[PDB]
Design a protein around this ligand. Structure first.
Ligand SMILES: *[C@@H]1O[C@H](CO)[C@@H](O[C@@H]2O[C@H](CO)[C@@H](O[C@@H]3O[C@H](CO)[C@@H](O)[C@H](O)[C@@H]3O)[C@H](O)[C@H]2NC(C)=O)[C@H](O)[C@H]1NC(C)=O
Ligand SMILES: *[C@@H]1O[C@H](CO)[C@@H](O)[C@H](O)[C@H]1NC(C)=O
Ligand SMILES: *[C@@H]1O[C@H](CO)[C@@H](O)[C@H](O)[C@H]1NC(C)=O
Ligand SMILES: *[C@@H]1O[C@H](CO)[C@@H](O)[C@H](O)[C@H]1NC(C)=O
Ligand SMILES: *[C@@H]1O[C@H](CO)[C@@H](O)[C@H](O)[C@H]1NC(C)=O
Ligand SMILES: *[C@@H]1O[C@H](CO)[C@@H](O)[C@H](O)[C@H]1NC(C)=O
Ligand SMILES: [Ca+2]
Ligand SMILES: [Ca+2]
Ligand SMILES: [Ca+2]
Lengths: 431, 199, 159, 378, 126
């Protein structure tokens, strides 16, 4: 019928051959054939696949990762690994990358393996730990909250880091070193953007939003060697609700209660309601405007990142933490969730600018030399590379994040950023 | 490098079945762990030569070390010494046999070595749970598996013992009266296992 | 400018583009509302084939029922006539119960005879997807079923 | 055992005598302290059991068996899949999709045919399946809409007892396509396609059900390797036709398109969280099931029937893991068994179906079914 | 407070803030405080009450320009009244002598324009 290749229909024996119905496109060629009758139709040659318009080389048919088609030889950068489109397949590398356990919002957690769950607690818990089993402990992080039964404005989280030597309590919005770790060689407190990024050890690192989000970054070393509210970092996601007494608890509340450090403090009650807590489900007003406002996550600015990272967990975190958290003036229970999602997006190299003059404003003029002249020494930057050479940290110390939002002192090569006066001055002026 | 005298450095696949029933007291279970550790200590522990796996069954398999695992033999020693004491009221020989037959030895990938299972029974499985015992024993026989029953304690079901032997040419039973005899017969047991050497 | 669709007569309809037909349903069919980002929906309630009540739903929270005999409800409770609320100023314009929503853009009237009416704004050009037909100048394609298949039987499209 | 934290001060108050560890309110002995699970105290030596693995409460710890439990790929409702590795997700695409196939050793190629099952665009359910067991020549079983079996096009009068197939009506009008004690597909003709599958297939399947290893993260794996972030891409990748529309923006709130149903949907799919199901809550979290029920009731032709489907799906999930809730009454849904048949929650299947009387040699290794069994002596 | 009692504004804030379900947009509460501050400023009692965590007000987007950063548009808690600009060269009698918000603190010359929101030489405007 249509040249240059021959045309066949069917053998008409018992309707066994594959007609026009079962056209082998590369995306379908690997997949098993259809379930229909012999339609007496044409098809591409045997070792040939009818991709796009018509026949196309079987070994040259593009692969797809985000729907988009990658021709053979292309490559993608998923996490820290890399893959190449070969034979309609992705030949990925294998380097288990760093794992982050963020404390999203005021009552939600995200484990290393990926699981996200809800655990409203008032007592002191274990975020990450090494005193799991036989393996000797090396560090231990406690995320003890305070007045945070339900997400509330008067909620402050008191992190307590029991690294090898001494506590590095992170209460309020500052860092206090109750005791000094014996090995002070590797202990850096990098204050960049809106965060107090630490470098506790060779591998572990805690990045703090300074208000309520605490992320702990590990490396290959700690794989399967951690426990607490952040799971075992084993890659497997189902076994991340193992209680202190080793057992996969079905509901997150009973899992979290196991890690309560103080056996006498309190057991958070199993709330029957699923969502729309506190004011929501009884306000209509509140739930409607919460869902409408907690939808910027799907807005155009986040559209590009909405595919790399699923915003549904952050949508739930925004719905929660906003109905219960009565926001007055310090309307941060919502901006914090949106900023957490923006940070997670940025980690995938998809920095997004969302703050405006109205929606979650954030100004840096106060630090812009307001003493006199207020020259533009400081700026707000969505990306703002986190770990930057400065007087305090001239060397390019390794950082667990790549580029973190907040105030950023953009200064030319001369007069590098200083530390105390928060002004970039002549390099010789550093200690 | 043999620690004391022995090194059965030959292609082999070995699985242990440390009993988890309450019949073996905490001290007795610790003696059994010492037995298994001192046993594997005299074997060329490596996927190239000897594959070792410990599977505690307390009415459900609790494999701590898999025959596919590849780690330092010292780490395997540590894990074997770390096997927790289940202390269950009833063990299940049939259940552990099914576990090894279907989930441990069902995907043959190394015929060079042989399959040997050390069933260290110390309690009587209820008759209601013995429906498929002979079936699983025969199935293991088909898979080229030799089961070496060990009647550790006086309560160790002996009817199943010598019945595993009956349905196999090489299935040998080591019926003991107490865990103490394990130290006495350690050399004999390792020797017997090395007689069926896959080289 | 603004389109107009009215459920006039006895069980009659006039889409936004002129196409008209007869339909006496019983399941409070969707008169107008975008099918992509709904955000509100005018619903023409029906009883035993007769046009009884014209309901409007905002998103999924606000429910208002207008009825043809002048009574009004919030979904579960009665209310007085002027009843200004979040948008949706439900008044009496010239003897007809007028329900006006300007933030979204529409005006629903129920005269004494019971002939409904709607005045959707231009910003729903080609966007509304209710029983009053999509608001495109083309009047022959106003039977777009919810399934997305253009039918010719008015009753299939209405149901 | 978080030492180094008790660094505040002494206080002159009571205490346990010397060695007793203070229990919740008593100074019980150190060894007698019980383990805690789901807010329950169990004396040491307790044998609390999971689906297939059993845990034993040792001193303040649970020693848990780590076997592999049989998988399940329930596809109830309007595209409410649940991968073998519990991965509750929804994908409303209208085409033929590969539910599960043994990629390593081709022995079954279960395929689902999906079509819009109502007027709402967010209403898609499977109406047929295409079990393709290649071991028994190349039979293409066709457990069609309405529980209609069809082998190679030719219809089949159940029960069928071919070489390995055992396609036979279950207690409640659902053909149970068994196999060589490795597949136990159950298909009621409307939605439900529970695919039991023995551990021998761990980490060997593909398709919508994804892997069976036991990790949810990998369950969004396309045949091309890379896992998909969004469900839409994952579902599209497993599409049979080259012509069906690739699903875009899988909608999550069908109730917006039908605002009138919001009140009923909220107030109806709430018994799942009500005390009636508190017994199962610990057994299974009704978060995915509540979401599925809300998405079903407010998206399908008959609200009450879909409410029945969703609530019954959650009840079945609970029952498969022990706890057996009541969930059957006017206001709820009812089985309304036909004349002669009776409800008798948790009956037995074997001792009826006189076919069984003719063949007494058959065994009875089946549990309760909660169906329409006959009264005693009948 | 000793010059104008805040009780009316205390009531206006307790009301209109419980009524408002301020989510993200926090203006319901902030607007009342800003109104009281404006009234205070009318009496020559300028107050700098805004902070980085209490109703923050930013001005970065103005200085954001193709030429990099201008550093001219900054938030002044009081600021002057109507400032002579290119479109309004002549002065005007404004009702309020001081009004908070963003404003460009341009050098002595090159008065502010309107369309481009940047201060340039008087020549480059009508
Ligand atoms: C305008 O038309 C509406 C729609 O028919 C009328 O609403 C109806 O009003 C009657 C008056 O009582 C209601 O009857 C009562 O219903 C309740 C609940 O079913 C029942 O318990 C009482 O015994 C009594 O039968 C009727 O339910 C209601 N129907 C609705 C709201 O759908 C309305 O009354 C009419 N306007 C006037 C001025 O009559
Ligand atoms: C990956 O690439 C290497 C080098 O070309 C090759 O040896 C290996 O087989 C490839 N692996 C896969 C899974 O394609
Ligand atoms: C943030 O800083 C980087 C480098 O310092 C720069 O490339 C980027 O444009 C900045 N983004 C802003 C100022 O919004
Ligand atoms: C209606 O929408 C379709 C798809 O969005 C578009 O192709 C078509 O042009 C639209 N019709 C009009 C009249 O704009
Ligand atoms: C029903 O099943 C039971 C199961 O134990 C069996 O004993 C009985 O004979 C069967 N028949 C009747 C009529 O109960
Ligand atoms: C505001 O402007 C006035 C007059 O231009 C000046 O005196 C005052 O210092 C300014 N305030 C700030 C905070 O810049
Ligand atoms: Ca894990
Ligand atoms: Ca039209
Ligand atoms: Ca699966």
């Amino acid at each position: 019928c249509r040249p240059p290749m021959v045309k066949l229909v069917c053998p008409a024996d018992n309707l066994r051959a594959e007609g026009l119905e079962c056209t082998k496109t590369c995306q379908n060629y690997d997949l098993e054939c259809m379930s229909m009758g012999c339609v007496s139709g044409c098809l591409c040659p045997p070792g040939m696949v009818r991709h796009e318009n018509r026949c196309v080389a079987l070994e040259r048919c593009p692969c797809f990762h985000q729907g988009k088609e990658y021709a053979p030889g292309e490559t993608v950068k998923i996490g820290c690994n890399t893959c190449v489109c070969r034979d309609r397949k992705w030949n990925c590398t294998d380097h288990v990358c760093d794992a982050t356990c963020s404390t999203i919002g005021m009552a939600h957690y995200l484990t290393f393996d990926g699981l996200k769950y809800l655990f409203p607690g008032e007592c002191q818990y274990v975020l990450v730990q090494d005193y799991c089993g036989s393996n000797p402990g090396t560090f231990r992080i406690l995320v003890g909250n305070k007045g945070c039964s339900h997400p509330s404005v008067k909620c402050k989280k008191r992190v307590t880091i029991l690294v090898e030597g001494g506590e590095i309590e992170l209460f309020d919005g500052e860092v206090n070193v109750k005791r000094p770790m014996k090995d002070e060689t590797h202990f850096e407190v990098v204050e960049s953007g809106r965060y107090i990024i630490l470098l506790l050890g060779k591998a572990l690192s805690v990045v703090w939003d300074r208000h309520l989000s605490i992320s702990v970054v590990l490396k290959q070393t700690y794989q399967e060697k951690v426990c607490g509210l952040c799971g075992n970092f084993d890659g497997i996601q189902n076994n991340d609700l193992t209680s202190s007494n080793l057992q996969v608890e079905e509901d997150p509340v009973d899992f979290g209660n196991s890690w309560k450090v103080s056996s006498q403090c309190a057991d958070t009650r199993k709330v029957p309601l699923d969502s729309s807590p506190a004011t929501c489900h009884n306000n209509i007003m509140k739930q409607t405007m919460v869902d409408s406002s907690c939808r910027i996550l799907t807005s155009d600015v986040f559209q590009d990142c909405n595919k790399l990272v699923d915003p549904e967990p952050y949508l739930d975190v925004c719905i929660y933490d906003t109905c219960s958290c009565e926001s007055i003036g310090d309307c941060a229970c919502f901006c914090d969730t949106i900023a957490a999602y923006a940070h997670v997006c940025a980690q995938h190299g998809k920095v997004v600018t969302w703050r405006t003059a109205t929606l979650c404003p954030q100004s840096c003029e106060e630090r812009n030399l307001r003493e006199n002249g207020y020259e533009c020494e400081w700026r707000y930057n969505s990306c703002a590379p986190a770990c930057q050479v400065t007087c305090q940290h001239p060397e390019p110390l390794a950082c667990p994040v790549q580029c973190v939002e907040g105030c950023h002192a953009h200064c030319p090569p001369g007069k590098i950023l200083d530390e105390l006066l928060q002004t970039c001055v002549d390099p010789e002026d550093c200690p | 490098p043999p620690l004391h005298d022995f090194y059965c450095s030959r292609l082999l696949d070995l699985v242990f079945l440390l009993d988890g029933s309450s019949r073996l007291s905490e001290a007795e279970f610790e003696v059994l762990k010492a037995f298994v550790v001192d046993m594997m200590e005299r074997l060329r522990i490596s996927q190239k030569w000897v594959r070792v796996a410990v599977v505690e069954y307390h009415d459900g398999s609790h494999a701590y070390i898999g025959l596919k695992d590849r780690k330092r033999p010292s780490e395997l020693r540590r894990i074997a010494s770390q096997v927790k004491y289940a202390g269950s009221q009833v063990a299940s020989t049939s259940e552990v046999l099914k576990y090894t037959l279907f989930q441990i030895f069902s995907k043959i990938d190394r015929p060079e070595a042989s399959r040997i299972t050390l069933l260290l029974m110390a309690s009587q499985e209820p008759q209601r749970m013995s429906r498929n015992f002979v079936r699983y024993v025969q199935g293991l026989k088909k898979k080229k598996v030799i089961v070496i029953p060990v009647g550790i304690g006086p309560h160790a079901n002996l009817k199943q013992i010598r019945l595993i032997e009956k349905q196999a040419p090489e299935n040998k039973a080591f019926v003991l009266s107490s865990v103490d005899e394990l130290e006495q017969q350690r050399d004999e047991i390792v020797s017997y296992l090395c007689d069926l050497a896959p080289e | 400018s603004t389109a107009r669709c009215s459920l006039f007569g006895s069980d009659f309809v006039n889409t936004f583009d002129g196409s008209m037909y007869s339909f006496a349903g019983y399941c409070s069919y969707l008169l107008a509302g975008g099918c992509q980002k709904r955000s509100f929906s005018i619903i023409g309630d029906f009883q035993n084939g007769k046009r009884v009540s014209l309901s409007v739903y905002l998103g999924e929270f606000f429910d208002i029922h207008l009825f043809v005999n002048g009574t009004v409800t919030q979904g579960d409770q009665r209310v007085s006539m002027p009843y200004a609320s979040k948008g949706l100023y439900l008044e009496t314009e010239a003897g007809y119960y007028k329900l006006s929503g300007e933030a979204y853009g529409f005006v629903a009237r129920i005269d004494g005879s019971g002939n409904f009416q709607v005045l959707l704004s231009d910003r729903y050009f080609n966007k509304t997807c209710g029983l009053c037909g999509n608001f495109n100048i083309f009047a022959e394609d106003d039977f777009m079923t919810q399934e997305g298949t253009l039918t010719s039987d008015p009753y299939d499209f209405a149901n | 055992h978080i030492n180094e934290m008790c660094q505040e001060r002494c206080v002159d108050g009571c205490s346990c005598p010397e060695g007793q560890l203070l229990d919740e309110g008593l100074c019980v002995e150190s060894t007698e302290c019980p383990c805690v699970h789901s807010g329950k105290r169990y004396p040491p030596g307790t044998s609390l059991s999971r689906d297939c693995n059993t845990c034993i409460c040792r001193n303040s710890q649970w020693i848990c068996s780590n076997e592999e439990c049989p998988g399940e790929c329930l596809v109830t409702g309007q595209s409410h899949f649940k991968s073998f590795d519990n991965r509750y997700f929804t994908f409303s695409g209208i085409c033929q999709y590969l539910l599960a196939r043994d990629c390593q050793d081709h022995s079954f190629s279960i395929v689902i045919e999906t079509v819009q099952c109502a007027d709402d665009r967010d209403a898609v359910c499977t109406r047929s399946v295409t079990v393709r067991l290649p071991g028994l020549h190349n039979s293409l079983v066709k457990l069609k809409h309405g529980a209609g079996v069809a082998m190679d096009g030719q219809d089949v009068q159940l029960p069928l007892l071919k070489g390995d197939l055992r396609i036979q009506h279950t207690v409640t009008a659902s053909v149970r396509l068994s196999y060589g004690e490795d597949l136990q597909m159950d298909w009621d003709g409307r939605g439900r396609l529970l695919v039991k599958l023995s551990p021998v297939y761990a980490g060997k399947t593909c398709g919508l059900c994804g892997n069976y290893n036991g990790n949810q993260g990998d369950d969004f794996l396309t045949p091309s390797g890379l896992a998909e972030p969004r469900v839409e891409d994952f579902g599209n990748a497993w599409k049979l036709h080259g012509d069906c529309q690739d699903l875009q923006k899988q909608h999550s709130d069908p109730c917006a398109l039908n605002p009138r149903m919001t009140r009923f949907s909220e107030e109806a799919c709430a018994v799942l969280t009500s005390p009636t199901f508190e017994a199962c809550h610990r057994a299974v979290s009704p978060l995915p099931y509540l979401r599925n029920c809300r998405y079903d009731v407010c998206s399908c032709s008959d609200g009450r029937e879909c409410l029945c489907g969703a609530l019954a799906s959650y009840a079945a999930a609970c029952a498969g893991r022990g706890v057996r809730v009541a969930w059957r009454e006017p206001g709820r849904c009812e089985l309304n068994c036909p004349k002669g048949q009776v409800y008798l929650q948790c009956g037995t299947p074997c001792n009826l179906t006189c076919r069984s009387l003719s063949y007494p040699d058959e065994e009875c290794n089946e549990a309760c079914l909660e169906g329409c069994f006959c009264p005693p002596g009948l």
